[PDB]
Design an enzyme around this catalytic site. Structure first.
Site, PDB file in Angstrom:
ATOM      1  CG  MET A   1      17.441  75.016  14.422  1.00 52.13           C
ATOM      2  SD  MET A   1      18.655  75.483  13.204  1.00 52.13           S
ATOM      3  CE  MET A   1      18.390  73.959  12.355  1.00 52.13           C
ATOM      4  CG  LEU A   2      15.981  80.745  16.748  1.00 50.71           C
ATOM      5  CD1 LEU A   2      16.062  82.248  16.797  1.00 50.71           C
ATOM      6  CD2 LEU A   2      14.997  80.258  17.810  1.00 50.71           C
TER       7      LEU A   2
ATOM      8  CG  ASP B   1      20.023  96.684  11.774  1.00 48.65           C
ATOM      9  OD1 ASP B   1      19.194  97.385  11.187  1.00 48.65           O
ATOM     10  OD2 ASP B   1      20.826  95.925  11.191  1.00 48.65           O
TER      11      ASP B   1
ATOM     12  CB  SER C   1      27.007  91.681   5.805  1.00 45.30           C
ATOM     13  OG  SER C   1      26.168  91.805   6.950  1.00 45.30           O
ATOM     14  CG  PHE C   2      26.774  87.573   9.826  1.00 42.89           C
ATOM     15  CD1 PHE C   2      25.472  87.981   9.593  1.00 42.89           C
ATOM     16  CD2 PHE C   2      27.073  86.205   9.858  1.00 42.89           C
ATOM     17  CE1 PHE C   2      24.462  87.034   9.437  1.00 42.89           C
ATOM     18  CE2 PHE C   2      26.077  85.275   9.666  1.00 42.89           C
ATOM     19  CZ  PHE C   2      24.771  85.683   9.474  1.00 42.89           C
ATOM     20  N   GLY C   3      28.912  86.657   7.508  1.00 38.22           N
ATOM     21  CA  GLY C   3      29.336  85.278   7.390  1.00 38.22           C
ATOM     22  C   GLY C   3      28.200  84.349   7.029  1.00 38.22           C
TER      23      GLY C   3
HETATM   24  C1  LIG Z   1      21.443  85.402   7.352  1.00 35.21           C
HETATM   25  O1  LIG Z   1      21.374  85.754   8.723  1.00 35.21           O
HETATM   26  C2  LIG Z   1      20.885  84.711   9.516  1.00 35.21           C
HETATM   27  C3  LIG Z   1      20.411  83.524   9.015  1.00 35.21           C
HETATM   28  C4  LIG Z   1      19.948  82.562   9.908  1.00 35.21           C
HETATM   29  C5  LIG Z   1      19.949  82.798  11.291  1.00 35.21           C
HETATM   30  C6  LIG Z   1      20.427  84.013  11.777  1.00 35.21           C
HETATM   31  C7  LIG Z   1      20.893  84.963  10.873  1.00 35.21           C
HETATM   32  C8  LIG Z   1      20.429  84.298  13.252  1.00 35.21           C
HETATM   33  C9  LIG Z   1      20.727  83.061  14.110  1.00 35.21           C
HETATM   34  C10 LIG Z   1      22.185  82.690  13.991  1.00 35.21           C
HETATM   35  C11 LIG Z   1      20.466  83.508  15.564  1.00 35.21           C
HETATM   36  C12 LIG Z   1      19.885  81.883  13.609  1.00 35.21           C
HETATM   37  C13 LIG Z   1      19.436  80.816  14.395  1.00 35.21           C
HETATM   38  N1  LIG Z   1      19.745  80.723  15.744  1.00 35.21           N
HETATM   39  N2  LIG Z   1      18.700  79.778  13.937  1.00 35.21           N
HETATM   40  C14 LIG Z   1      18.393  79.816  12.649  1.00 35.21           C
HETATM   41  N3  LIG Z   1      18.769  80.753  11.781  1.00 35.21           N
HETATM   42  C15 LIG Z   1      19.508  81.797  12.260  1.00 35.21           C
END
Ligand SMILES: COc1ccc2c(c1)CC(C)(C)c1c(N)ncnc1-2
EC number: 2.7.11.23
Length: 346
Positions: free
Chosen positions: A107-108, A154, A36-38
């Site tokens: 990056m996660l 949340d 939803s945020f982008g």
């Molecule tokens: C659809 O919402 C998402 C989709 C992927 C990620 C996030 C929200 C959270 C953040 C931006 C923290 C993140 C990250 N750091 N590394 C990998 N994927 C993600």
């Protein structure tokens, strides 16, 4: 028709282009998430010589401002956890790019709902559930430090991410709907399945609402399915009541929304309002949902190591303390970390 000089779509999302270079610094590699945020992209930071995730916020005031709250809370958490020991995602920096606020993170990997899908919705082991529980209670302990006093508001499997797909390390993400104690503004909060009884009832709330959500998340991590899957608020409260019984009268007597769900009888006790049909109150035992004495959820952990009756009793007890109807007595992070579920035996 043109949006943001051709950079955006009609939904105010930046139109992501593989390989694009930004600010003589980032090379956008690929889209890795959308919500939803982008959008979230994997990008190479040429200056720091590392991969990063960039959360590209919609070019729309409501989304921008939600992300500005997130930036301020992540920066505050940064001042206070420089070794990254407390399981909150690390915000490296932010910038405005072509009218999109962009948050640069470490990056996660994928989120805990994706992990549940990967188990075919059968759940993860009790041992892995315990590792997630220990890390989440540590995070909640950090958020409860007085200079933070952050209520995430949340928590749900989708907002907990693995660091690495092979491994148990996790980080909490998404602080856009968060607030601090003593700057509580929201009356409507939490995703429905994880929403605490105090919020359902329209009562005052504090950091204990995140512990309620955590109790719900940990049962779902082990069973594969949401504990309380309400279709609406009345259904949500009724599902809670199937497991936990009617909330205490002392709570209902002070709840602005008690009558949305319950009726007060002549003797001053409370009952459910009739349907317009649930298991009677408290008869859907968590003891049975978890399969404490019957081989775990669905009987599927029968004959597996790491799933004894004794360990299930410890897990059940901790969850029941996280699901206390009274937010004053609900277990707090410091004490959850000391619970016998985290004490090794044998
Ligand atoms: C659809 O919402 C998402 C989709 C992927 C990620 C996030 C929200 C959270 C953040 C931006 C923290 C993140 C990250 N750091 N590394 C990998 N994927 C993600």
């Amino acid at each position: 028709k043109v949006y943001n000089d051709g950079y955006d779509d009609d939904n105010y999302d930046y139109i992501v282009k593989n390989g694009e270079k930004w600010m003589d610094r980032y090379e956008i590699d690929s889209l890795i998430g959308k919500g939803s945020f982008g959008q979230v992209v994997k990008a190479y930071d040429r200056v720091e010589q590392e991969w990063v995730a960039i959360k590209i916020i919609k070019n729309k005031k409501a989304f921008l401002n939600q992300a500005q709250i997130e930036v301020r809370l992540l920066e505050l958490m940064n001042k206070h956890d420089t070794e990254m020991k407390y399981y909150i995602v690390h915000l490296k920096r932010h910038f405005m790019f072509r009218n999109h606020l962009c948050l640069v993170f470490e990056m996660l990997s994928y989120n805990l709902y994706d992990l549940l899908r990967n188990t075919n919705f059968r759940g993860v082991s009790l041992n892995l559930t315990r590792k997630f529980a220990q890390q989440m209670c540590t995070a909640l302990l950090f958020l409860a430090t007085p200079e933070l006093s952050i209520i995430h508001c949340d928590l749900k499997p989708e907002n907990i991410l693995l660091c690495n797909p092979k491994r148990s390390a996790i980080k909490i993400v998404d602080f856009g709907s968060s607030c601090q104690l003593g700057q509580r503004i929201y009356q409507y909060i939490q995703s429905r399945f994880y929403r605490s009884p105090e919020v359902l009832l329209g009562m005052p709330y504090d950091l204990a609402i995140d512990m309620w959500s955590l109790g719900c998340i940990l049962v779902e991590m082990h069973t594969g399915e949401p504990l309380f899957s309400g279709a609406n608020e009345v259904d949500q409260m009724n599902k809670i009541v199937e497991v936990l019984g009617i909330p205490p009268a002392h709570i209902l007597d002070q709840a602005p929304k008690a009558r949305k769900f319950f009726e007060k009888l002549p003797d001053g006790t409370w009952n459910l309002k009739k349907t317009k049909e649930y298991k009677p109150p408290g008869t859907r035992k968590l003891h049975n949902i978890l399969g404490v004495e019957t081989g775990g959820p669905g009987g599927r952990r029968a004959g597996e190591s790491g799933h004894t009756v004794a360990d299930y009793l410890k897990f059940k007890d901790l969850i029941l303390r996280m699901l206390d109807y009274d937010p004053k007595t609900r277990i707090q992070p410091y004490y959850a970390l000391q619970h016998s579920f985290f004490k090794k035996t044998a």
